[model samples]
Target chain A: TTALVCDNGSGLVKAGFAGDDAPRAVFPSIVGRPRHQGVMVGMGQKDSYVGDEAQSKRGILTLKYPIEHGIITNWDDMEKIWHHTFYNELRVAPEEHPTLLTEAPLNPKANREKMTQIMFETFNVPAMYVAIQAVLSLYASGRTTGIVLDSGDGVTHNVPIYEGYALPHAIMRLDLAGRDLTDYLMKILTERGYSFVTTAEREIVRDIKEKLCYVALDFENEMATAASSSSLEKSYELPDGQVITIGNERFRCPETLFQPSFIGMESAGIHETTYNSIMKCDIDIRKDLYANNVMSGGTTMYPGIADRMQKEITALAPSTMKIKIIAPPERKYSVWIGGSILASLSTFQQMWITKQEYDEAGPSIVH
Target chain B: TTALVCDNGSGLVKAGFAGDDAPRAVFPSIVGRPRHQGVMVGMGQKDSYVGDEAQSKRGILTLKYPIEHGIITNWDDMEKIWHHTFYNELRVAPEEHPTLLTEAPLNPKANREKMTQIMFETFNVPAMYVAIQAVLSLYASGRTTGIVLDSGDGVTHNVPIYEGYALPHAIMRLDLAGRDLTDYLMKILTERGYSFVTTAEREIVRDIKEKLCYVALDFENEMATAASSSSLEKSYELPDGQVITIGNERFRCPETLFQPSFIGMESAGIHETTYNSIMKCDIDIRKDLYANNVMSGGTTMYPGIADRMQKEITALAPSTMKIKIIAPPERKYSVWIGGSILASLSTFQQMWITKQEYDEAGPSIVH
Candidate 1:
């Protein structure tokens, strides 16, 4: 039997045997181990380990999990836990079947080599296939020369795809992500005199951004109306039953992605920056890629993103240029679909170095 | 002798016998004539009317004078200007007995009123004290507290004084003064990624903060150290120039004071809200005041004030208690030394008016 798997960090793990109609299992890439003898792991109670619970229990227990910055940074402990879960889910021992996995583009040679070594040394799989997840997504989307913006948990990467190949020079990375946004919200609340002594109350503030946050069209105007004595501002009830007016301008906090100047950074707006990166390439490339803008990764789930991107890009582009924002019907699952598609391609199989080559080359294969 | 001097609607007439140290002359407060014959009298210079030659060729010109923020809010035509200047100055004209002269406190109500009524009626002497000059020596060492923070044209005040009883509050007022540190600096040189149309020189950057800035000790460290490399740190340029380092922690912008928060009502820095206001009160009373903090307005004269304020205040007080920061001293006059001390003195003149008295007296005295 064969199994296909894709890991985008953030406690997301998908796996299934080859020829299976769909993935057999989908669970958070998180695991919990208590300090003492009694330890447990469960999907429903991920809070017990990965999200809020892990945060609160920080001093008492250390967190052990795979995936950081959308890739496995700490391999030893993370790899062990990942395999433990994989074996448990499949109900099979190591050295059982061939496995196909996905990795980042231009993956650090060291990390890639280490990963290949780990798969052979630990699982002892008879055969293995590894490929770049971004390239797979571009192939799956059926577009050749446009920008692909992938915002995941740890970082947001903008990759320009030309003629079905990723452009190395056009890529830009910012030190902003979902985790950073969440932490920023927490800090703002604390500084503004919010006390989070109670667990339940803390949870509400943590979740407020996801449930009620929105991007403001005109931040200054919206903030002024909310800050004024107007009754239109939204408010949320805390655990203590106190309701505080949430200003629309508060949403301006996240709008920094497009307006880097808000945070005193030099980067252009996301759409403009993306467009500029593409335009820097051959003009023909930009013309061909103008309508192929693709949005993926977890952050794509944000509401109004597609429409906002479309409007902003259209305004930034020349009057004669055509602009479009493509939101794949299955945006969330598209990356995984890329992985599956790669696994089925016979020619793509050659891209994956066999255990024999990895053993001979060692970690140098990363270069 | 009685002299009637008229330029437009407002005019000055002084009639009395001359005495020792007294000059037999008529000086017009109004400078130029209106474009229309029957309009109002204008103060200071008129178009094509140079100061040294205005008397010789005073047909029409632009008026240039000392009075700026004060007394100018109500300027209309020659009538209003004549009443405020020429007629007002003549009311205090003295004859014989070596007349003493004085000017109003920029634009004092008592001075203007006495010039209209009391000078002519109460002081029946043919000759009287004519003029007084009020110089706000925010630049003088003796008058400043902690630091002399003056923000006038071509002058920024951030002088530190050890004593507190110099310039009193009743004589002081706060406005957007000289030390507009960030804006002035931005005009010359941009920081971070923002570009300036002006020259790109290191000395210009230093001038931005050093020549016309203050210490915002609180947020200075953060601003100085915040880095783009990691969310946990800030980025700042080292003196060495080659070494670029991220700030060790988060830093707040001190610039918020002028802009205020999004709500617009709540003050950002305590400098203007509490420090400057409290400074206007009696020094004796401040010792036991819950906010009996020292005067450090001028101490705020630094480049990275927002970050500096965060650092200094934290060290000055205990962790749990809150410490307040005033705006940069150059932005406000240390009026507390004068105002509070004067208010406490039994001999000091009183400026207060009761509601009933103002209602019955009418606009003439009420102003």
Candidate 2:
């Protein structure tokens, strides 16, 4: 009686067997397709693939990257790739094992129901368990009280875990993430009249964003540097072998994750929003959670993110409160590790309901 | 004294002089350019082209259509067209004859100053008159009191006129007009998988919008009809004999003008916004204006507009309030007629401040 676990944040899909090797796969949640019909020949055949392959295809293949605000909008097309990729990796036949698919905490009930129906009806899985990834992450870390900051591809979901359970009312979502960073890079490229129609131009912009991009500790100084005529060249590079020599400039891209109003929006930034969400929980939960805070997700891979989060949270929390970022060894694989731990547990097996039960109970019982 | 009068509105531009062979020109306030460097050789070279010709060249050459949100965003481009077109039509030297130009009532000070600067600098004219088009229209029509609704290309500016003078405080500006309508049309077409790359396809969509689109009396019914399954084969033919079918069942393009909420916005419809704007004025102004409501602009040329405005205004107004829709003979030329009448009057002539006065007074006084 072993439980299976899975965690699919907006960015990566982390999956592995209970007590098995570190995540069998951790791939970006991106799907790609060919630009024109019949361009998929020889080495070009790989052009029509998804994830890293599809992203590399860029300008050559008209890419349809479709997750809006951290939820699948083009679910029909994306589902085909999801199933094919998932089945290909896990090799989990319907007759073999029950599935435990993790989702965002406080996800709309309608979305949860849809996921349950898909697993049972489409995949014909024998059994399924639906749990929130942040809650499971906290459980895996063995932290009875902590705050979980999970920033993925599209948006960041901040959840406060208290007494071994997620405080659903204390969850907050912000629309600033990797996709927004990509968009900012795209805008910079567009302003310079760089052609995004070519793979080379797209890669140049992406590379610049990855290499030169960093969170600004002091926004005004960083903005001055980014906006100065001399700093433009140092900050970005042209498609041709010329370096963009923008000097003394800190990246404005990362700062947007914290202060969206700088770009003419009224919403609270990710850091402030997360702190505010945690504060709304019970006073004891807030106190205990602040001391054992954890950072997990692809977004945490950015340089100085741990320090930034620590500094921001310390300033935001009450004077008496203390905070620490639980620096996991493999930052990106923490969710996968958490998933595997959940799978190893025998008692959690009770949470996995069978297809027979699903069929008898109907889709409504997934709740 | 011979004077040429020019009136540019959100929807159309009207130009002619008093005692001339009627209003000489009336055209939609639109301009188009080519996408490729060379396709049809000098296809869109006119200094001041409008309507179908301007639209036809879109994507074939780079376009610079000035009117946006019912006002000019590119005054430099617009001034060139205005000066050239008006002087060419009148066949008069700048020093020999004076010109009269009409601008919106309560136009932003920046826009007004820019207009004044352009007229004096570009044409080197000795004298020029600037008057509010709504006031001029009221004067020409001999209306002592009325509500003037100017629904033009970029924005609709509505003013209540009493005894041939606008109640300055009783003006309303709606930031949606023909340009927004075109943008909404383009968005729908793009989302529906229409290939806008080809000029032919772009023109076809533009034509369909101009010829078949209309303001909805009941937005819900209009949307239902447009989006119904049975309306798929509603096709329109292009000038080149290429047939394109529109998804009539799911194509309620004009519904946006009446109910912006259909597009996830919280804006009052044209009628409601107009009513709300008028209500902000004095009760006496409202009463006197309601019974002599005037409809002027390119939008007013659409069939049933006067009747629709009258009916909608009446329904939204107080039960005892009367609503009248005065469709001026040559509704499009009314703005120009007003400008011409203003130019001919000696008292109005005093309003024409020279470059000397402007230089002495400085930009601050102009603003």
Candidate 3:
């Protein structure tokens, strides 16, 4: 029997059967309720919606992101999201197969205990395994020992993994991520007479950030030469058929990952975070961490992010250390892809916390 | 009447009367009590000693730092420090003259109120004024509108000032400072068979850091060429007359200010903090902030800190902006010197909050 694999990010949720090359059900990880609940009963519309359905009704509904910074906050809404993913998205019976889920680094132990109870008691899954996203991301790159710089919509993490185990103490988290850049782009657009008042309208800015932005190799030189009518200027059409043009903001948006100070963030830039995380690890493992600097998550999709990160960190790292950045083409989906690869392996089937084990020991068995 | 000007740093306390070019009484900002009070009572020693006297007995006494991270924590011990400053050190009566004290940036309003009450009710000072250390340091540099990067023993602060008023929102603090480097040096020394278990041993490390460490402009190139036999290595004499030599740690210890990742600190390095602080200010004042980057505190006394800071910031800052770093020869005492300058001014005499104001409005009069 095939297994269900799901990787839930703050911005997107990817779910599909094991052994798939790509996630079959990819949508925003958001749930929504009609703003005026009772009044919508006669319109033949459901009171609540999940994923794409919720995104489509964003303008007319009140949206709630259950996973904030990649941790489930609202239990009931998360249950709703999981319920939709089970029946409507995957169209699979939870009782038939094992399941695999992903989690952020440093997630509280209580949250996992709660998640295990829900997965067993409510969904009736035969077995389940929760994986650290950074470890799985590194696993997707075909290395068990490495450092993963995972920057997504809600948060950026610098996690060091050795022999498939994440070093907990050395892991670093920065709150600035893709959504921050999107919001930054929105700030720049607003200053240019363009407005983003509604939630759906803000997605327009996200889209512009995604399609137009690229990290600059030399931020100062780029900023120096970039002018009002430079070659790097790009334009996008809004919903109202009006085109808005942005010149320097395209590169400036992604530059925050390199220099977070640009956006008033007090934490070190991504490169510094990565270097610091590596330095905190055991001295013997530092060489391996430097050699396998894997990249993951959607935020790193910018054209020059890996190169910029490599260059900056190399400047800070010791000259004798070999600094390499592995940016796979499918890094944006590395976590879910890793889950898919793992759950499909016949050898790994015995590794899951079985329903019998759960019944005997309860949620503590997940530990 | 001459006023007393005192600036207390975690490592040193500087006290002098108004119109003095430098502090007349400079000593450790610490208090000490005999380890075994009853055992030492027979030796004809006092119950406690402050500043120089305390530091002299450190080997046989238990030391307590009343001020930490540039804030007064142990109020009783702090009063003892101030009391000693007034009586034995300055040989002055509190009722005769007004007083001026310096505080770290973003210190709580409640702290100022407590200090004001103590200055009036306890010390019986005729008048008092608490000045922000960063602003005072800027004043010492002859600029009221600028960015001050003050790195001291316990903490580092990046504060932006305009027209004598600090922009609170733009202020940044990093817990990495002189003590961190000293500990780092101790760590490196410990690995090399030099143990620093005692508090006195740690001070030896601090002395080494202060006298030998320097910021490296090109970290990678310097590290690549720095060998055991390199010219950068230096030797220091221990209290026991043993000579200990340090090679790369001379540059490596101070490099933390630029790349905090080297020491596992997750915040932006000093240069990044300075640039971020400036960027957070009003756009119109940014040009001036860049032009008048003032350095203060003992940690900024390193020989190459100004040049290295200016270089790093220039790479991140806009090319058109003129980046300047003013490293005063006496930056180690800039706060006390600035306070001296202010209290000596005939125009500033009327600015002090008098005893009549405290009687009418209580501690809130300081606000």
TM-score of each: 0.46, 0.55, 0.54
lDDT by residue for model 3 (A1-367), tens = 7888888788888899888888998888777776543553468478678888887776666667787776678888888888988898789899998899888887678668888899999889888999888877876887888899898888889899988766889999888788778866765554354646445666678888889999999898888778436687777887679998777788998998888776665788899999999989999999998998899999999998888887898899998878888999989999988898888778887889988888998776776
For candidate 2, state the interface root-mean-square deviation in angstroms to 1 decimal.
Answer: 14.3
Residue A293, model 2: Cα distance from true site in angstroms:
22
Q: Which candidate number maximizes lDDT? A: 3
Instruction: Give candidate 1's TM-score.
Output: 0.46
What is the per-residue lDDT of model 1 for residues A45-82, given as tens digits with 9 covering 90 to 100? 33345433454553333344466665676666567555
lDDT of each: 0.46, 0.64, 0.82
| Model 2 regions lying over 4 Å from their true place | A1-83, A91-367, B10-13, B20-57, B65-75, B86-92, B139-142, B195-208, B225-227, B231-233, B236-252, B260-267, B277-288, B301-311, B327-330, B341-367
In Å, residue B353's CA in model 1 sits off its true spot by: 23
Chain B TM-score for candidate 3:
0.94
Clashing pairs in 3: none
CAPRI-style quality class for the chain A–B interface of candidate 2: incorrect
Ranking of candidates on TM-score, top first: 2, 3, 1
DockQ of 3: 0.01
> Which of candidates 2 and 3 reaches a greater TM-score?
2
Which should have the higher TM-score, number 1 or number 2?
2
List iRMS (one decimal) for every candidate: 19.9, 14.3, 15.3
Residue lDDT tens for model 1, B206-236: 3334443333344435455443445533234
Chain A (alone) TM-scores for all candidate structures = 0.79, 0.84, 0.94
